[PDB]
Amino acid sequence: QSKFRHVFGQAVKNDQCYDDIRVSRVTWDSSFCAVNPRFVAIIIEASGGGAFLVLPLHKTGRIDKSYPTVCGHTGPVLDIDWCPHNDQVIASGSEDCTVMVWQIPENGLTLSLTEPVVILEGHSKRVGIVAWHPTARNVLLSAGCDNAIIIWNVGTGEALINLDDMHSDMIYNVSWNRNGSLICTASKDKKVRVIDPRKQEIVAEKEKAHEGARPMRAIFLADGNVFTTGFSRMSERQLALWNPKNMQEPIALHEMDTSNGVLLPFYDPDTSIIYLCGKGDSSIRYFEITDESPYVHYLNTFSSKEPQRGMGYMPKRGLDVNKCEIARFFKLHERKCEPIIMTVPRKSDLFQDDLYPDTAGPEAALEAEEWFEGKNADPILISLKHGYIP
């Protein structure tokens, strides 16, 4: 009976792709791609040091080899994240052990961008993880191969939290909860941790959340549940759903297939859909999360003949309500970025308001100093109906 059962993906025509990109060749498990309503950012092969490419969404077709890039890093770029409160601002983590924050010029680059707004220098090792705070302006989390998590005030350039003796082994990912009061981590010691970064304490963990000696991912759902991907002892890709108030036993665990890539979860809290795709997969599998067991329900698979090297995900503000678009993927091939549009088939030409509840907007709910000092706020919601045409 699920309203999302006919959700389907459709790749755009080649003339709506971004072509002749030289995607990074590093063996780091990066997503290589970050998208916002103005720009697509792609981690590329740099002559020296490190670079990423920033394209206006309209700049489709073959990209000139000399198109300007963001190239101020002195080591390969490993992760990129657009500022949720500023569509001209992006953070990068590098093998040069820095996080850099960049101001993109209006309409994108004319000249190569070599000087960041700020360099953050707390890590002693490569920085593979950057995550902007969901609600607090200028709060930015990095995690490095030093196994330190640092939470920055980007406005002052100061490390205000250093979690440096919490993780004995490599950190695979860090995710903020809805109001950014908590983070969750997955680590190569096979633990998933829920952390209060301001209290600097672990509030819940699960040992061996997955048994495989392969990477995991852990993210928060809108209701405070933690959703994980990983591998069985037998190389099966798995997903699980955990109540952090009681992590002994999973609410749900599902075995999927025996491919090699870790499943990156993309969670849409507005539809309760989770999309899963791994490096090397030609498929995007999507599930609905509901309060009816077994709680994680299979919807469908987007199928293709081409494996992904990385994947970006368009925030709600960039979607087309008239088309009932509920997600847009930016699928990285070897030399190309290919938008994939997820739509709900609907007969009616009316505004499908059930698909588009008010969504987390770009206005920061509180300042860095307020949040660091212990204040909390929810995302400030906006309506998407201004985009509707009769």
mmCIF file of C-alpha atoms in Angstrom:
data_model
loop_
_atom_site.group_PDB
_atom_site.id
_atom_site.type_symbol
_atom_site.label_atom_id
_atom_site.label_comp_id
_atom_site.label_asym_id
_atom_site.label_seq_id
_atom_site.Cartn_x
_atom_site.Cartn_y
_atom_site.Cartn_z
ATOM 1 C CA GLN A 1 0.000 0.000 0.000
ATOM 2 C CA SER A 2 3.131 2.381 0.129
ATOM 3 C CA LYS A 3 2.689 5.728 -1.711
ATOM 4 C CA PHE A 4 6.457 5.546 -2.586
ATOM 5 C CA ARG A 5 6.246 2.055 -4.260
ATOM 6 C CA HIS A 6 6.394 3.553 -7.834
ATOM 7 C CA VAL A 7 9.263 6.028 -7.070
ATOM 8 C CA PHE A 8 11.658 5.675 -10.054
ATOM 9 C CA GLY A 9 14.940 7.237 -11.213
ATOM 10 C CA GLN A 10 15.737 8.642 -14.685
ATOM 11 C CA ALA A 11 19.206 9.786 -15.858
ATOM 12 C CA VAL A 12 19.219 13.112 -17.825
ATOM 13 C CA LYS A 13 20.362 13.186 -21.537
ATOM 14 C CA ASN A 14 24.159 13.462 -22.108
ATOM 15 C CA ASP A 15 23.872 17.219 -22.963
ATOM 16 C CA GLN A 16 22.635 17.791 -19.331
ATOM 17 C CA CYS A 17 25.773 16.049 -17.887
ATOM 18 C CA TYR A 18 29.146 17.568 -16.891
ATOM 19 C CA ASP A 19 31.717 15.849 -19.151
ATOM 20 C CA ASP A 20 35.525 15.343 -19.539
ATOM 21 C CA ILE A 21 36.156 15.762 -15.754
ATOM 22 C CA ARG A 22 39.349 14.093 -14.390
ATOM 23 C CA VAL A 23 37.904 12.615 -11.142
ATOM 24 C CA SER A 24 40.461 12.075 -8.318
ATOM 25 C CA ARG A 25 42.351 8.710 -8.498
ATOM 26 C CA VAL A 26 43.072 8.473 -4.722
ATOM 27 C CA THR A 27 42.251 5.169 -2.964
ATOM 28 C CA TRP A 28 40.639 7.128 -0.066
ATOM 29 C CA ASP A 29 36.953 6.093 0.323
ATOM 30 C CA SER A 30 35.593 9.639 -0.555
ATOM 31 C CA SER A 31 32.169 10.432 -2.115
ATOM 32 C CA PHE A 32 34.210 12.836 -4.430
ATOM 33 C CA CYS A 33 31.043 14.986 -5.076
ATOM 34 C CA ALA A 34 29.051 17.682 -3.157
ATOM 35 C CA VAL A 35 26.059 19.521 -4.747
ATOM 36 C CA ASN A 36 23.959 22.543 -3.725
ATOM 37 C CA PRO A 37 21.201 24.504 -5.571
ATOM 38 C CA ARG A 38 23.855 26.698 -7.333
ATOM 39 C CA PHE A 39 26.902 24.415 -7.861
ATOM 40 C CA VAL A 40 28.280 20.925 -8.406
ATOM 41 C CA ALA A 41 31.697 20.374 -6.659
ATOM 42 C CA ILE A 42 33.900 17.414 -7.853
ATOM 43 C CA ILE A 43 37.258 16.264 -6.378
ATOM 44 C CA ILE A 44 39.632 16.084 -9.389
ATOM 45 C CA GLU A 45 43.198 14.928 -10.239
ATOM 46 C CA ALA A 46 45.534 17.888 -9.427
ATOM 47 C CA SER A 47 48.880 18.411 -11.327
ATOM 48 C CA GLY A 48 50.332 19.183 -7.821
ATOM 49 C CA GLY A 49 48.849 19.302 -4.269
ATOM 50 C CA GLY A 50 45.010 19.082 -4.403
ATOM 51 C CA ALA A 51 42.013 20.591 -6.212
ATOM 52 C CA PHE A 52 38.269 20.364 -6.660
ATOM 53 C CA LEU A 53 36.129 21.670 -9.532
ATOM 54 C CA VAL A 54 33.112 23.990 -8.829
ATOM 55 C CA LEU A 55 30.623 24.283 -11.735
ATOM 56 C CA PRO A 56 27.487 26.421 -11.925
ATOM 57 C CA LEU A 57 24.554 24.004 -12.508
ATOM 58 C CA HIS A 58 24.021 25.594 -15.998
ATOM 59 C CA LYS A 59 27.626 24.819 -17.111
ATOM 60 C CA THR A 60 26.731 21.424 -18.755
ATOM 61 C CA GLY A 61 28.670 19.689 -21.605
ATOM 62 C CA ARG A 62 32.435 19.193 -22.063
ATOM 63 C CA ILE A 63 34.393 21.160 -19.420
ATOM 64 C CA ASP A 64 37.493 22.906 -20.943
ATOM 65 C CA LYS A 65 40.781 21.396 -19.521
ATOM 66 C CA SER A 66 41.795 24.953 -18.351
ATOM 67 C CA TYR A 67 38.462 25.721 -16.582
ATOM 68 C CA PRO A 68 39.452 27.352 -13.246
ATOM 69 C CA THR A 69 39.539 25.099 -10.110
ATOM 70 C CA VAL A 70 39.836 25.468 -6.308
ATOM 71 C CA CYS A 71 43.535 24.444 -5.985
ATOM 72 C CA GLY A 72 45.067 26.066 -2.809
ATOM 73 C CA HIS A 73 45.542 22.677 -1.006
ATOM 74 C CA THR A 74 49.136 21.226 -1.169
ATOM 75 C CA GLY A 75 47.926 17.555 -0.914
ATOM 76 C CA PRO A 76 45.040 15.606 -2.543
ATOM 77 C CA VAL A 77 41.548 16.760 -1.454
ATOM 78 C CA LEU A 78 39.633 13.956 0.342
ATOM 79 C CA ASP A 79 36.183 15.440 1.312
ATOM 80 C CA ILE A 80 34.005 18.489 0.478
ATOM 81 C CA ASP A 81 30.812 19.848 2.127
ATOM 82 C CA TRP A 82 28.717 22.922 1.151
ATOM 83 C CA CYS A 83 27.723 25.206 4.014
ATOM 84 C CA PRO A 84 23.991 24.573 4.764
ATOM 85 C CA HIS A 85 23.564 28.359 5.553
ATOM 86 C CA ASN A 86 25.575 29.788 2.610
ATOM 87 C CA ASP A 87 25.386 28.357 -0.964
ATOM 88 C CA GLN A 88 28.667 30.241 -1.874
ATOM 89 C CA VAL A 89 30.712 28.567 0.964
ATOM 90 C CA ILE A 90 32.340 25.084 0.837
ATOM 91 C CA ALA A 91 34.775 23.261 3.227
ATOM 92 C CA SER A 92 37.512 20.828 2.034
ATOM 93 C CA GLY A 93 39.700 18.281 3.914
ATOM 94 C CA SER A 94 43.099 17.304 2.444
ATOM 95 C CA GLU A 95 46.114 14.957 2.752
ATOM 96 C CA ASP A 96 47.920 18.285 3.608
ATOM 97 C CA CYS A 97 46.254 17.746 7.128
ATOM 98 C CA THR A 98 44.245 21.043 6.782
ATOM 99 C CA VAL A 99 40.565 21.938 6.489
ATOM 100 C CA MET A 100 40.086 25.002 4.256
ATOM 101 C CA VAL A 101 36.867 27.085 3.930
ATOM 102 C CA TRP A 102 36.280 28.789 0.558
ATOM 103 C CA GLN A 103 34.136 31.716 -0.623
ATOM 104 C CA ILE A 104 33.019 30.910 -4.202
ATOM 105 C CA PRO A 105 32.520 34.140 -6.245
ATOM 106 C CA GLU A 106 28.936 34.894 -7.406
ATOM 107 C CA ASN A 107 28.205 32.852 -10.611
ATOM 108 C CA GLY A 108 31.302 30.640 -9.900
ATOM 109 C CA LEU A 109 35.046 30.958 -10.670
ATOM 110 C CA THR A 110 36.610 33.187 -13.376
ATOM 111 C CA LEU A 111 40.160 32.650 -12.052
ATOM 112 C CA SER A 112 41.632 29.703 -10.126
ATOM 113 C CA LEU A 113 40.825 30.032 -6.391
ATOM 114 C CA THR A 114 44.076 29.610 -4.374
ATOM 115 C CA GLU A 115 43.460 31.587 -1.070
ATOM 116 C CA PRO A 116 40.763 30.227 1.294
ATOM 117 C CA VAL A 117 38.811 32.435 3.757
ATOM 118 C CA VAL A 118 40.444 30.374 6.578
ATOM 119 C CA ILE A 119 42.865 27.415 7.084
ATOM 120 C CA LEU A 120 42.101 25.158 10.136
ATOM 121 C CA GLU A 121 45.332 23.292 11.199
ATOM 122 C CA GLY A 122 44.458 21.025 14.205
ATOM 123 C CA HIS A 123 45.000 17.545 12.599
ATOM 124 C CA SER A 124 48.438 15.788 12.466
ATOM 125 C CA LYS A 125 47.172 13.424 9.701
ATOM 126 C CA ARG A 126 45.078 13.514 6.463
ATOM 127 C CA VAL A 127 41.521 14.889 6.984
ATOM 128 C CA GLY A 128 39.005 12.632 5.228
ATOM 129 C CA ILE A 129 35.832 13.983 6.905
ATOM 130 C CA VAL A 130 34.208 17.458 7.038
ATOM 131 C CA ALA A 131 30.614 18.012 8.237
ATOM 132 C CA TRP A 132 28.976 21.464 8.684
ATOM 133 C CA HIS A 133 26.650 21.814 11.713
ATOM 134 C CA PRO A 134 22.956 21.646 10.695
ATOM 135 C CA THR A 135 21.660 24.635 12.797
ATOM 136 C CA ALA A 136 24.636 26.649 14.175
ATOM 137 C CA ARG A 137 26.263 29.232 11.799
ATOM 138 C CA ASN A 138 30.047 28.680 11.290
ATOM 139 C CA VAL A 139 30.277 25.415 13.280
ATOM 140 C CA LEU A 140 32.292 22.839 11.231
ATOM 141 C CA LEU A 141 33.386 19.296 12.275
ATOM 142 C CA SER A 142 36.518 17.589 10.866
ATOM 143 C CA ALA A 143 37.835 14.080 11.547
ATOM 144 C CA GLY A 144 41.360 13.001 10.560
ATOM 145 C CA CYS A 145 43.433 9.785 10.339
ATOM 146 C CA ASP A 146 44.921 10.979 13.691
ATOM 147 C CA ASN A 147 41.498 9.639 14.937
ATOM 148 C CA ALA A 148 40.744 13.160 16.366
ATOM 149 C CA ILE A 149 37.355 14.897 15.887
ATOM 150 C CA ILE A 150 37.707 18.718 15.984
ATOM 151 C CA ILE A 151 34.728 21.122 16.068
ATOM 152 C CA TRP A 152 35.668 24.570 14.754
ATOM 153 C CA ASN A 153 34.273 28.099 14.916
ATOM 154 C CA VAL A 154 34.951 29.021 11.246
ATOM 155 C CA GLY A 155 34.366 32.732 12.061
ATOM 156 C CA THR A 156 37.353 32.859 14.500
ATOM 157 C CA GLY A 157 39.472 29.939 13.137
ATOM 158 C CA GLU A 158 39.535 28.313 16.639
ATOM 159 C CA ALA A 159 39.213 24.579 17.541
ATOM 160 C CA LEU A 160 36.657 24.797 20.400
ATOM 161 C CA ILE A 161 36.171 20.968 20.879
ATOM 162 C CA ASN A 162 38.979 18.345 20.465
ATOM 163 C CA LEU A 163 37.813 14.713 20.853
ATOM 164 C CA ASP A 164 41.368 13.211 20.618
ATOM 165 C CA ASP A 165 41.239 10.080 22.955
ATOM 166 C CA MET A 166 37.730 8.723 21.971
ATOM 167 C CA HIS A 167 38.591 6.591 18.875
ATOM 168 C CA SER A 168 41.516 4.072 18.955
ATOM 169 C CA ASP A 169 41.016 3.256 15.230
ATOM 170 C CA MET A 170 40.072 4.896 11.937
ATOM 171 C CA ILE A 171 36.811 6.885 11.824
ATOM 172 C CA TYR A 172 34.797 5.943 8.694
ATOM 173 C CA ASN A 173 32.176 8.782 8.963
ATOM 174 C CA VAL A 174 30.618 11.367 11.385
ATOM 175 C CA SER A 175 26.956 12.489 11.221
ATOM 176 C CA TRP A 176 25.164 15.252 13.199
ATOM 177 C CA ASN A 177 21.651 14.551 14.530
ATOM 178 C CA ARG A 178 18.648 16.770 13.493
ATOM 179 C CA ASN A 179 19.485 19.773 15.786
ATOM 180 C CA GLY A 180 23.239 18.964 15.979
ATOM 181 C CA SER A 181 23.215 18.252 19.772
ATOM 182 C CA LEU A 182 24.802 14.782 19.134
ATOM 183 C CA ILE A 183 27.159 13.128 16.562
ATOM 184 C CA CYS A 184 27.390 9.446 15.606
ATOM 185 C CA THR A 185 30.552 7.743 14.347
ATOM 186 C CA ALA A 186 31.448 4.374 12.800
ATOM 187 C CA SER A 187 35.066 3.152 13.279
ATOM 188 C CA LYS A 188 37.314 0.295 12.049
ATOM 189 C CA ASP A 189 37.129 -1.164 15.643
ATOM 190 C CA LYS A 190 33.525 -2.055 14.442
ATOM 191 C CA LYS A 191 31.836 0.211 17.122
ATOM 192 C CA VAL A 192 29.060 2.735 16.342
ATOM 193 C CA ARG A 193 29.154 5.566 18.965
ATOM 194 C CA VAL A 194 26.600 8.259 19.858
ATOM 195 C CA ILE A 195 28.519 11.226 21.336
ATOM 196 C CA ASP A 196 27.643 14.489 23.046
ATOM 197 C CA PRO A 197 30.569 16.576 21.672
ATOM 198 C CA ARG A 198 29.962 19.565 24.088
ATOM 199 C CA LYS A 199 29.876 17.210 27.177
ATOM 200 C CA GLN A 200 32.843 15.354 25.462
ATOM 201 C CA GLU A 201 31.273 11.964 26.533
ATOM 202 C CA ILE A 202 30.066 8.829 24.607
ATOM 203 C CA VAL A 203 26.305 8.529 25.539
ATOM 204 C CA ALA A 204 25.768 5.097 23.775
ATOM 205 C CA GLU A 205 27.821 2.585 21.717
ATOM 206 C CA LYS A 206 27.369 -0.758 19.977
ATOM 207 C CA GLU A 207 30.368 -3.107 19.715
ATOM 208 C CA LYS A 208 30.477 -5.164 16.442
ATOM 209 C CA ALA A 209 27.466 -3.252 15.006
ATOM 210 C CA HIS A 210 28.642 -5.169 11.866
ATOM 211 C CA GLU A 211 31.169 -8.107 12.053
ATOM 212 C CA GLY A 212 32.950 -7.679 8.633
ATOM 213 C CA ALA A 213 36.537 -6.265 8.464
ATOM 214 C CA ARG A 214 35.180 -3.713 5.916
ATOM 215 C CA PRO A 215 33.961 -0.114 6.347
ATOM 216 C CA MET A 216 30.676 0.884 8.056
ATOM 217 C CA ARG A 217 28.547 4.072 7.925
ATOM 218 C CA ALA A 218 26.286 5.433 10.727
ATOM 219 C CA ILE A 219 23.723 8.298 10.389
ATOM 220 C CA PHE A 220 20.848 9.697 12.483
ATOM 221 C CA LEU A 221 17.224 9.536 11.336
ATOM 222 C CA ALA A 222 14.823 12.418 12.194
ATOM 223 C CA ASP A 223 13.462 10.421 15.268
ATOM 224 C CA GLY A 224 16.946 9.958 16.881
ATOM 225 C CA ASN A 225 17.341 6.322 15.654
ATOM 226 C CA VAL A 226 20.780 5.481 14.124
ATOM 227 C CA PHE A 227 20.945 3.767 10.706
ATOM 228 C CA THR A 228 24.083 1.778 9.797
ATOM 229 C CA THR A 229 25.522 0.030 6.752
ATOM 230 C CA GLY A 230 28.345 -2.502 6.774
ATOM 231 C CA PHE A 231 29.345 -6.097 5.992
ATOM 232 C CA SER A 232 28.840 -9.585 7.534
ATOM 233 C CA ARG A 233 31.810 -11.969 8.228
ATOM 234 C CA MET A 234 30.637 -13.570 4.890
ATOM 235 C CA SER A 235 31.151 -10.293 2.803
ATOM 236 C CA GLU A 236 27.323 -9.608 2.627
ATOM 237 C CA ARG A 237 26.355 -5.871 2.604
ATOM 238 C CA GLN A 238 23.931 -5.157 5.464
ATOM 239 C CA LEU A 239 21.879 -2.323 6.899
ATOM 240 C CA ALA A 240 20.642 -2.003 10.509
ATOM 241 C CA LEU A 241 18.454 0.337 12.576
ATOM 242 C CA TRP A 242 19.372 1.021 16.258
ATOM 243 C CA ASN A 243 17.538 2.726 19.166
ATOM 244 C CA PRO A 244 20.456 4.510 20.941
ATOM 245 C CA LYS A 245 18.387 4.398 24.222
ATOM 246 C CA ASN A 246 18.775 0.541 23.865
ATOM 247 C CA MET A 247 21.494 -0.513 21.321
ATOM 248 C CA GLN A 248 21.838 -4.153 22.592
ATOM 249 C CA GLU A 249 19.602 -5.536 19.754
ATOM 250 C CA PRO A 250 18.865 -4.017 16.318
ATOM 251 C CA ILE A 251 15.265 -2.812 15.583
ATOM 252 C CA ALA A 252 16.035 -4.120 12.014
ATOM 253 C CA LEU A 253 18.860 -5.877 10.155
ATOM 254 C CA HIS A 254 18.712 -6.763 6.433
ATOM 255 C CA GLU A 255 21.311 -8.599 4.265
ATOM 256 C CA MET A 256 21.352 -7.326 0.658
ATOM 257 C CA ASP A 257 24.089 -8.646 -1.701
ATOM 258 C CA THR A 258 27.874 -9.499 -1.799
ATOM 259 C CA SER A 259 29.305 -6.497 -3.827
ATOM 260 C CA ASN A 260 32.515 -4.757 -2.609
ATOM 261 C CA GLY A 261 31.647 -1.027 -2.076
ATOM 262 C CA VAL A 262 30.439 0.279 1.329
ATOM 263 C CA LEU A 263 26.773 1.443 1.007
ATOM 264 C CA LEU A 264 26.595 5.289 1.420
ATOM 265 C CA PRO A 265 23.212 6.118 3.027
ATOM 266 C CA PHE A 266 21.288 9.175 1.726
ATOM 267 C CA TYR A 267 18.371 9.807 4.046
ATOM 268 C CA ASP A 268 15.485 12.148 3.156
ATOM 269 C CA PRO A 269 13.674 12.922 6.463
ATOM 270 C CA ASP A 270 10.773 14.593 4.496
ATOM 271 C CA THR A 271 9.718 11.268 2.808
ATOM 272 C CA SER A 272 11.495 8.797 5.228
ATOM 273 C CA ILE A 273 13.274 7.286 2.189
ATOM 274 C CA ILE A 274 16.865 6.091 2.440
ATOM 275 C CA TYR A 275 18.839 5.609 -0.794
ATOM 276 C CA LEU A 276 21.870 3.263 -0.720
ATOM 277 C CA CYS A 277 24.670 3.223 -3.318
ATOM 278 C CA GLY A 278 28.253 1.918 -3.111
ATOM 279 C CA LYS A 279 31.415 2.725 -5.023
ATOM 280 C CA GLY A 280 31.462 0.298 -7.993
ATOM 281 C CA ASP A 281 27.627 -0.262 -7.995
ATOM 282 C CA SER A 282 25.499 0.438 -11.117
ATOM 283 C CA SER A 283 22.340 0.427 -8.866
ATOM 284 C CA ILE A 284 20.704 2.764 -6.296
ATOM 285 C CA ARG A 285 18.466 0.773 -3.873
ATOM 286 C CA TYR A 286 15.876 2.705 -1.804
ATOM 287 C CA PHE A 287 13.850 1.759 1.299
ATOM 288 C CA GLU A 288 11.079 3.403 3.349
ATOM 289 C CA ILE A 289 11.488 3.626 7.164
ATOM 290 C CA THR A 290 8.115 3.254 8.995
ATOM 291 C CA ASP A 291 6.760 2.291 12.453
ATOM 292 C CA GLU A 292 5.364 -1.014 10.996
ATOM 293 C CA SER A 293 7.850 -3.945 11.317
ATOM 294 C CA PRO A 294 10.195 -4.847 9.829
ATOM 295 C CA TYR A 295 10.535 -0.992 9.916
ATOM 296 C CA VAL A 296 12.931 -0.925 6.896
ATOM 297 C CA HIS A 297 10.907 -1.726 3.710
ATOM 298 C CA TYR A 298 12.283 -2.245 0.144
ATOM 299 C CA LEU A 299 10.777 0.163 -2.442
ATOM 300 C CA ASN A 300 12.737 -0.308 -5.668
ATOM 301 C CA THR A 301 16.138 -0.202 -7.466
ATOM 302 C CA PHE A 302 17.389 2.353 -10.015
ATOM 303 C CA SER A 303 19.352 0.180 -12.524
ATOM 304 C CA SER A 304 22.038 1.239 -15.042
ATOM 305 C CA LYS A 305 24.904 -0.321 -17.073
ATOM 306 C CA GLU A 306 27.534 2.072 -15.498
ATOM 307 C CA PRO A 307 29.336 1.787 -12.114
ATOM 308 C CA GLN A 308 29.563 4.902 -9.865
ATOM 309 C CA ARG A 309 32.968 6.306 -8.691
ATOM 310 C CA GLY A 310 31.120 8.818 -6.393
ATOM 311 C CA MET A 311 27.774 10.424 -5.668
ATOM 312 C CA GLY A 312 26.308 13.841 -4.757
ATOM 313 C CA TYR A 313 22.802 14.623 -3.454
ATOM 314 C CA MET A 314 20.823 17.818 -4.170
ATOM 315 C CA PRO A 315 19.189 19.545 -1.138
ATOM 316 C CA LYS A 316 15.348 19.987 -1.333
ATOM 317 C CA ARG A 317 15.599 23.692 -2.416
ATOM 318 C CA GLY A 318 17.079 22.545 -5.773
ATOM 319 C CA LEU A 319 14.198 20.097 -6.609
ATOM 320 C CA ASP A 320 11.230 20.615 -9.056
ATOM 321 C CA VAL A 321 7.872 20.309 -7.154
ATOM 322 C CA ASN A 322 5.871 20.381 -10.469
ATOM 323 C CA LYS A 323 7.632 17.113 -11.511
ATOM 324 C CA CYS A 324 7.152 15.564 -8.035
ATOM 325 C CA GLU A 325 11.012 15.267 -7.930
ATOM 326 C CA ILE A 326 11.891 14.121 -4.331
ATOM 327 C CA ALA A 327 15.669 13.511 -4.857
ATOM 328 C CA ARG A 328 18.376 14.311 -7.450
ATOM 329 C CA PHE A 329 21.618 12.275 -7.457
ATOM 330 C CA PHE A 330 24.865 13.493 -9.083
ATOM 331 C CA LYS A 331 26.488 10.209 -10.144
ATOM 332 C CA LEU A 332 30.266 10.373 -10.840
ATOM 333 C CA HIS A 333 31.591 8.112 -13.594
ATOM 334 C CA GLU A 334 35.325 8.061 -14.542
ATOM 335 C CA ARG A 335 35.081 11.302 -16.694
ATOM 336 C CA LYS A 336 31.441 12.474 -16.211
ATOM 337 C CA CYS A 337 28.875 13.718 -13.654
ATOM 338 C CA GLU A 338 25.318 12.493 -14.455
ATOM 339 C CA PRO A 339 22.190 13.802 -12.682
ATOM 340 C CA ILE A 340 19.631 11.072 -11.758
ATOM 341 C CA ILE A 341 16.089 12.368 -11.003
ATOM 342 C CA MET A 342 13.835 10.485 -8.523
ATOM 343 C CA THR A 343 10.072 11.264 -9.091
ATOM 344 C CA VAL A 344 6.786 10.008 -7.566
ATOM 345 C CA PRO A 345 4.325 9.282 -10.437
ATOM 346 C CA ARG A 346 1.099 11.358 -9.785
ATOM 347 C CA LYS A 347 -1.961 11.759 -12.138
ATOM 348 C CA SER A 348 -3.055 15.149 -10.624
ATOM 349 C CA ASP A 349 -1.483 18.465 -11.880
ATOM 350 C CA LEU A 350 -2.361 19.978 -8.435
ATOM 351 C CA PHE A 351 0.528 20.829 -6.041
ATOM 352 C CA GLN A 352 1.319 17.460 -4.337
ATOM 353 C CA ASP A 353 1.684 19.034 -0.875
ATOM 354 C CA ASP A 354 1.911 15.538 0.776
ATOM 355 C CA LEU A 355 5.337 15.053 -0.965
ATOM 356 C CA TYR A 356 6.605 18.529 0.151
ATOM 357 C CA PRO A 357 6.194 19.265 3.888
ATOM 358 C CA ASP A 358 8.088 22.400 5.055
ATOM 359 C CA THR A 359 11.836 21.474 4.972
ATOM 360 C CA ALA A 360 15.059 22.590 6.780
ATOM 361 C CA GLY A 361 15.936 25.974 5.228
ATOM 362 C CA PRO A 362 19.224 27.892 4.766
ATOM 363 C CA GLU A 363 18.744 30.320 7.745
ATOM 364 C CA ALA A 364 21.056 29.378 10.695
ATOM 365 C CA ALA A 365 18.895 28.895 13.858
ATOM 366 C CA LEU A 366 21.728 30.012 16.240
ATOM 367 C CA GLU A 367 25.302 31.413 16.243
ATOM 368 C CA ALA A 368 28.541 29.426 16.846
ATOM 369 C CA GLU A 369 29.120 31.034 20.328
ATOM 370 C CA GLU A 370 25.501 30.298 21.518
ATOM 371 C CA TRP A 371 25.770 26.612 20.419
ATOM 372 C CA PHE A 372 29.286 26.105 21.885
ATOM 373 C CA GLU A 373 27.926 27.587 25.195
ATOM 374 C CA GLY A 374 25.187 24.880 25.251
ATOM 375 C CA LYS A 375 22.110 26.388 23.447
ATOM 376 C CA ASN A 376 20.001 24.183 21.068
ATOM 377 C CA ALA A 377 17.607 25.074 18.224
ATOM 378 C CA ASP A 378 15.752 23.141 15.488
ATOM 379 C CA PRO A 379 16.222 23.858 11.782
ATOM 380 C CA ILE A 380 14.116 26.787 10.562
ATOM 381 C CA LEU A 381 11.747 25.375 7.945
ATOM 382 C CA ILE A 382 10.748 26.909 4.593
ATOM 383 C CA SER A 383 7.915 26.065 2.147
ATOM 384 C CA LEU A 384 8.744 24.764 -1.411
ATOM 385 C CA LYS A 385 5.325 25.831 -2.895
ATOM 386 C CA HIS A 386 6.694 29.137 -4.390
ATOM 387 C CA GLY A 387 8.093 26.782 -7.126
ATOM 388 C CA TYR A 388 4.599 25.405 -8.060
ATOM 389 C CA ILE A 389 3.064 26.457 -11.422
ATOM 390 C CA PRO A 390 -0.607 25.788 -12.303
#
